[PDB]
């Protein structure tokens, strides 16, 4: 019954990313003294379905000269990576129990830039290529600090196994052990998914949108598991599932809140932000988190 498990992982995620559009519209509207969609469906609830059908029945505008191969490949890679990044996560029990699950998620996120590169290349435009290059540069820049912050945090866990993160946070959350790293991690996950204040950039358009929103939800779930450790009772995992889902929803709504609250950076300003504020602090706190367990004789078990 492994195929049923794969399907019960894939399908609910796609429904969640479909209704996240509704939630975002509703939340931004109410923060803007108005409503979101409240006409299509009893409480707007049929708006995502109408959006999907309309998008899937509209003419697709193939560039008529661009590389059709990469034009079709880019959304495939984007959505495949987005759906793959959900497999490693333990909610409480993971679909695939990987020893180096964190490294696997890092590698998937690193691949996620080929879709941007290929979509920019296959637009047959100089301006869109400029935009794609900017997006790729921002993404790689911030995944640097994601990797460094992540290993610094994992030094208190003892391994790359994501399940052990539940064991590490049995008594206290990781947010109390390292809140500065969590702050920079949150900003880096904003900048990684091209979300405001870092949003400088028919069918396949919807495919790309689905991939981006799935990446948003997965990144927030990863943040919740990494820094907000729920308590897991082996004889009733549904408590852990509900707690983890609530925390993930809170973080996604916080993304919407941030989008509704701020202006956006310039390109050079966010580049300077990273390279001159996050990287120095990230290196310093990596040094500190290497030294800390040895100084206090609190090194985690697994080797």
């Amino acid at each position: 019954m492994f195929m049923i498990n794969i399907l019960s992982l894939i399908i609910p995620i796609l429904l969640a990313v479909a209704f996240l559009t509704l939630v975002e519209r509703k939340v931004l509207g109410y923060m803007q003294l108005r409503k979101g969609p409240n006409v299509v469906g009893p409480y707007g609830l049929l708006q995502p379905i109408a959006d999907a059908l309309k998008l899937f029945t509209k003419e697709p505008l193939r560039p008529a000269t661009s590389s059709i191969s990469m034009f079709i490949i880019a959304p495939i890679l984007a959505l495949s990576l987005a759906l793959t990044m959900w497999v490693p996560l333990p909610m409480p029990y993971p679909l695939i129990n990987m020893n180096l699950g964190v490294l696997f998620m890092l590698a998937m996120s690193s691949l996620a830039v080929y879709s941007i590169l290929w979509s920019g290349w296959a637009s047959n435009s100089k301006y869109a290529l400029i935009g794609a290059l900017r997006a790729v540069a921002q993404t790689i820049s911030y995944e640097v600090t994601l990797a460094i912050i992540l290993l610094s945090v994992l030094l208190m866990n003892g391994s790359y196994t994501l399940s052990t993160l539940i064991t590490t946070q049995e008594h206290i959350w990781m947010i109390f052990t390292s809140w500065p790293l969590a702050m920079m991690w949150f900003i880096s996950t904003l900048a990684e998914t091209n979300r405001a204040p870092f949003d400088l950039t028919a069918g396949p358009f919807a495919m790309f949108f689905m991939a981006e929103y799935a990446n948003i939800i997965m990144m927030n779930a990863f943040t919740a598991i990494l820094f907000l450790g729920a308590s897991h009772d082996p004889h009733t995992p549904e408590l852990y599932t509900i707690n983890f889902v609530l925390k993930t929803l809170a973080l996604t709504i916080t993304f919407l809140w941030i989008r509704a609250s701020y202006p956006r950076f310039r390109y050079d300003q966010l580049m300077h932000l990273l390279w001159k504020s996050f990287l120095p602090l990230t290196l310093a706190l990596c040094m500190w988190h290497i030294s800390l367990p040895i100084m206090t004789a609190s090194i985690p078990p697994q080797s």
Partner: protein, 210 residues
């Protein structure tokens, strides 16, 4: 609005910027020559269409100066009141669309509710939300309805909190400051020699207000 902008870039930096205008040239000045003064009044509503009443007042004052007459005191007080209301409308529009273009977008809705209230005032006085054509070169078209002043007072006693919320979203925000500070710096002498007026002068320290 509608704008074409041809520029030359060396990498990130802007080297040259040449704006192309005339995409909204309707030929208003030639059309005015075929109308009477009254018939030519409504063009000034359409000129700067965010501050409709102020445009009307300028034309009316010019025609009054040429006619050698003067509006009565009540008309003048009405004109100054609605000129200040129009200044509120225009500054809301300018600040919130600036912020929207930068990417803030929330104060736009917050303040466009107030803009809707001021269109209610414009509508009560003239029957039209924007192009009122209320200020005529002899005064104003019609008297204020009986309950208008009370509603204006009720509106204007809550607006300071709206400006405060705008400032809380914008003034001390570091992203906003980094987007605005030291951008487009213009000296007083250049502002004067280039024909600037209004805040473009006063932002450079020139003390001038008509």
């Amino acid at each position: 609005g509608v704008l074409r902008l041809v520029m030359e870039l060396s990498g990130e930096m802007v080297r040259k910027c040449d704006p192309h205008i005339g995409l909204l040239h309707r030929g208003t000045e030639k059309l005015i020559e075929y109308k009477t003064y009254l018939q030519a009044l409504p063009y000034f509503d359409r000129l700067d269409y965010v501050s409709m009443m102020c445009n009307e007042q300028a034309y009316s004052l010019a025609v009054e100066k040429l006619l050698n007459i003067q509006p009565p005191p009540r008309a003048q007080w009405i004109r100054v009141l609605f000129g200040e209301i129009t200044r509120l409308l225009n500054h809301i529009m300018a600040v919130t669309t600036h912020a929207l273009d930068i990417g803030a977008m929330t104060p736009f809705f917050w303040m466009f509710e107030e803009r809707e209230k001021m269109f209610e005032f414009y509508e009560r006085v003239s029957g039209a939300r924007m192009h009122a054509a209320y200020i005529r070169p002899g005064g104003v078209h019609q008297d204020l309805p009986l309950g208008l002043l009370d509603d204006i007072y009720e509106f204007s006693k809550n607006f300071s909190f709206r400006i405060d919320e705008l400032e809380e979203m914008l003034t001390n925000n570091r992203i906003w400051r980094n987007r605005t500070v030291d951008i487009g710096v213009v000296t007083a002498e250049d502002a004067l020699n280039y024909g600037f007026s209004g805040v473009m002068l006063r932002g450079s320290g020139i003390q001038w207000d008509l």
